[PDB]
């Protein structure tokens with residue numbers, strides 16, 4: 001709804017603004033894929049001992 | 050100060066200009082795809 | 093001459109100290125390179141001021157002052173050109189040196205990727221050879237074997 | 246004074262090129278080319294050191310003759326066959 005008045009310029013700034021946050025979200029998303037599987041393996045060790 | 054600036058740079062080289070040139074190339078469609086789709090999302 | 097296996101570890105550790113020192117020395121050189129570049133720009137700024145200063149210097153009609161200002165800058169113009177060329181040779185040279193360092197670092201770790209392996213094969217043989225002196229073959233019945241030297245005792 | 250600093254603007258550079266070569270030349274004595282197979286390379290000087298002990302320990306306790314190994318397999322031939330042959334006759 002930013003440019004509903006016809007000010008298409010504001011749209012690029014908002015979209016350019018989010019790409020900074022989009023990169024961060026993807027960075028954490030992948031980082032939480034590796035750690036999720038690793039600890040579960042560790043939990044097996046404790047239950048074994 | 051300048052010594053430490055380059056010394057830290059060698060220990061972890063920065064990305065090549067091609068990487069930055071392509072990184073902007075990839076970002077070009079990211080905004081355009083959203084911006085182009087934005088016109089097609091409300092029309 | 094000492095034990096060759098000890099030589100490798102001592103020699104390899106010495107090189108690693110040398111390599112990092114090369115990293116430091118290059119860092120200082122690339123800094124002065126930067127400092128000289130900045131110093132070059134400052135000089136032309138003053139000469140730029142004199143030339144701009146000379147533009148309005150004679151607006152009253154005193155053309156004489158113009159020559160002094162222009163004659164003044166030529167001293168700075170010569171210096172700027174002297175540094176400009178001097179920074180053309182050095183700029184390309186160090187970049188070649190940087191290639192050497194990147195080459196050694198990549199190859200250096202390859203040697204260390206193997207040194208631990210050779211130290212293992214060596215000690216397996218040494219310990220194994222140590223066996224033949226204490227027991228060897230039970231039927232040896234020779235002096236070398238420790239048991240036989242005890243059996244006769 | 247003007248000229249003095251010019252020399253110091255370069256001295257740090259030459260000290261860098263010098264140490265790159267010296268360290269690089271130090272490489273050819275430890276590893277060089279893996280196929281060198283020469284005394285100079287440290288690895289080869291270590292590679293033979295192991296091989297020496299291999300044969301030296303062999304002479305001090307000679308290995309079994311090929312006939313012994315040939316017969317040792319001959320004896321093992323019936324050990325499995327006698328059990329394997331008997332296995333068919335143990336369940337039939």
Ligand SMILES: Nc1ncnc2c1ncn2[C@@H]1O[C@H](COP(=O)(O)OP(=O)(O)O)[C@@H](O)[C@H]1O
Nearest residue numbers: 228229231232233234235236237304305306307
């Ligand atoms: N099957 C065997 N293998 C090795 N040595 C044997 C065997 N049977 C008897 N011997 C005797 O054991 C000795 C082993 O020699 P060794 O102890 O190596 O000599 P040294 O005392 O110089 O070390 C030989 O002199 C040999 O006569």
Ligand SMILES: Nc1ncnc2c1ncn2[C@@H]1O[C@H](COP(=O)(O)OP(=O)(O)O)[C@@H](O)[C@H]1O
Nearest residue numbers: 273274276277278279280281282283284285286
């Ligand atoms: N591709 C190769 N490059 C260099 N040396 C090789 C190569 N292939 C085999 N060699 C052998 O490695 C040796 C390297 O010589 P080098 O170790 O420099 O002699 P030195 O022991 O006097 O230093 C040569 O004698 C050569 O026979």
